[PDB]
Amino acid sequence: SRLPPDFFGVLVRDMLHFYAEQGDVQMAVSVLIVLGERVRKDIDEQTQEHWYT
Amino acid sequence: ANIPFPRTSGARFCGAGYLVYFTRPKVIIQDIACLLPVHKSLGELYILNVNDIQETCQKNAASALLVGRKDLVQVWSLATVATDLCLGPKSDPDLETPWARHPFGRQLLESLLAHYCRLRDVQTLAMLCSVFEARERERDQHDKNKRLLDPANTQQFDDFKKCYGEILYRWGLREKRAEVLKFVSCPPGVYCSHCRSEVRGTQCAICKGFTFQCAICHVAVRGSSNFCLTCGHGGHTSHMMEWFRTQEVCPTGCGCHCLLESTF
Amino acid sequence: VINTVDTSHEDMIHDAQMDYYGTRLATCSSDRSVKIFDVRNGGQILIADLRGHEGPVWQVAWAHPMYGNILASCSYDRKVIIWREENGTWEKSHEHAGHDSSVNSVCWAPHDYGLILACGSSDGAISLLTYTGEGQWEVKKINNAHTIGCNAVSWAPAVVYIKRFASGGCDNLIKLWKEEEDGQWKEEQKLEAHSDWVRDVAWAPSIGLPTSTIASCSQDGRVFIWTCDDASSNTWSPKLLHKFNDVVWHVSWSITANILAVSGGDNKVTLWKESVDGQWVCI
Ligand SMILES: [Zn+2]
Ligand SMILES: [Zn+2]
Ligand SMILES: [Zn+2]
Ligand SMILES: [Zn+2]
Structure with a gap:
């Protein structure tokens, strides 16, 4: 066993x-x-752009 | 008539890791201990300090490694990193945001606690709740807010410790039960030599003097002691421990074999 | 593992239960005797061969070690007889026979309350024996309990007091009880989802989860789990786990209330465990 695959996702x-x-x-x-790539497909595409800009 | 039919086969859970059953053709005892969330070895190897928590966490992480609890080595390391004295709360609410409001504090504690409640593991819950315990309307809300355990759920955190203490008593470890129960929030006629009065305490109230006087040592006793019920002579515990290790008479020449009167 | 023990009795065996530490083992039988062994490191040693209780014994129940070495033993002779261990010897201490019919079930109360023993006989009453001190026992009865008679009793875990137990009988209804402020054992509720006869009932230990669980066993054969997590709504929702082909006899919980062991007339013992999906699977 283990902790579930993505317990902290x-x-x-x-x-x-925050x-x-x-x-x-x-x-x-x-x-x-x-x-x-472990947090990439969780944040909406229009928020990463805002944060980068 | 009205009596039911006789039983001829049964099975009960006894002890903390045993099963007792019998069937129609003897009774046998099977050790069902690989079926339970709790573990006997961890209970023996788990330490729980109150002064150095940064050492407790690592000591328990090593113990969890020694048994094969892969999921627990992560948790203990996370607790190690999340309980440093560097993250101490400050009194002023305007100086900084507390570590409790951070998503890696209270919200992660409650994400581990619910998972282990579902898995139904009292041991880890009880050990985790112990480690993480350390105008003017605002200041009050700040004081309620700077804590990693919700102050509106103290009852649950206490019954966790209570049940684990009962388990440890069942197993046979009485020191480690007291160590655990120490974290629960809620609480659970010697004659004087100067006035010959019944005084309840280490100091008199009439003459304001010491009432108990060591019967080997004659330095006043203010801490722990023991005495014979009938002769009424005793003193410092180690003193009598040495004295009675080889003799059987009252040290003040009284004539009682206090070993036969003190011990029932 | 295994710790095989030969009883050396002359008739069938009706109950067997171990101590609070894992060191002693009491056995009832159909020879009007109760043999206390000492099961340590596989040893089939003898410590007592207590006799009396003219009829055949049916059940035993050890007490909490904090009160010393006590043992309750009911039987057909409509007499409950209680034992102690004075100076390393087991002896008869007190007998009580305030029951017209056979006393069927005995169950000690939680140790926080004190030393209370609940005995339900086949004459439709429950007798509660309270240890009043200085070798004195106080008996308070509950007449007209079940239509025919109680069969099994169980005590609920203590929470922060309100004493409360749960009895079942031959009326096919499970009843709940509560002790009033004065001392009146007022009835609170009654549950009816069985068909033939309930024989044993068991209340789950608590580890702090706001949820009370009661198992049940019927003569036709059905183990129903009576979950209730509505805090103060006092509402219970029956479920089911199986429908067997014999008379279900006894059900026992684990210390953490995750595994149930059920034994019935099929001459076999089964284990169970609740799955993530909410269904009960064997193991
Ligand atoms: Zn004085
Ligand atoms: Zn001294
Ligand atoms: Zn003396
Ligand atoms: Zn003496």
Whole structure:
């Protein structure tokens, strides 16, 4: 056994939104770039664009 | 008539890891312990300090490794990283946002707790609730907000510890039950030598002096002690422990074999 | 593992139960005797061969070790006889025979309340024996309990007090009880989903989840799980687990209330476990 495949998949998204709401987009963008593909298909396409710009 | 038909086969869960059953053609005892969420070995190897939590977490992580709890090594490491003294709350609400409001605090604690409640594992719940315990209307809301455990759910966190304590008592470990129960939030005539009065305590109330005097040592006893019920002479516990290890008379020359009167 | 033990009795065996620590084993039988062994490291040793109780014994029940070594033993002779261990010897301590018919079930109360023993006989009454101190027992009866007679009793876990137990009998209805402020054992509710006869009832231990679970067993054969998680609504919803081909005798919970063991007239013992989907599967 183990913890279920994606047990924390719903908390990294909340962390990213938590950091982006305060105005700290640096942390969100850096985490998005570092992680790469494990958090990618969870955030809407029009929010990543806003954060990057 | 009205009596039911005789029983001739049964099975009961006894102890903490045993099954007792008998069938029509003897009774046998089968150790059903690989069927339960709790574990006996972990209970023996789990430490729970109150001064150094950063060492408790790693010590338990190693113990979980020694048994094969892959899912638990993650949890203990996460608890290790999430309980540093560097994340201490501040008194002023305007200085900073608390760590509890962060999504990696209270919201992750409640995401582990519900999963283990579904799995029905008292051991991990009870050990996790113990580790994570450490105008003016606003300040009050801040004080309620800077905590990792919801202050409106204290009852559940306490009954977890209570049930685990009963389990540990069943297994046969009495020190580790007291250590666990120490975290529960809610609570559970010596004669004087100067005035010859019945005083309840280490200090007198009439002459304001020491009432108990060691019968080997004659330094006043303010801590732990033991005495004979009839002779009424005793003192520091280790003192009598050494004295009575080889003799059988009252140390003050009284004539009682207190080993036959003190011990029923 | 296994710890095979030879009873050395002359007749059938009706009940068997171990202690609170895993060290002793009491056995009822049909020879008017109760043999207490000492099952340690596989040893089939003997410590007592308590006799008396003219009829055939039916059930036993150990008490909490915090109150010492006690043992309740009911039988056909309409007498409950209670044992102790004084100076390393087992002896008869007290007998009570306030029942017209045979006493069928005995069950100790939770230790937080104290030392209360609930016995339900076949004459449709429950007798509660409270240890009043200095070797004194107080008996309070509940007359006209079931239409024909009670068969099994169980005590609910203690929560923060309101004492409450659950009895079942030959009227095919499961009843709930509560002790009033004065002391009146007022009835609270009654459940009716069985057909033939309920023989044993069992209430689940609590580990803090706001949910009370009661198992049941019927003569026709049906184990119904009576979940109730509506807090203070006092509403119960029956379910089902199987429909057997014999008389279901006894059901027992685990310490964490995750596995149920059911034994009936089929001369076999089955285990069960609730699945994620909400159905009960064997194992
Ligand atoms: Zn004095
Ligand atoms: Zn001394
Ligand atoms: Zn003396
Ligand atoms: Zn003495």
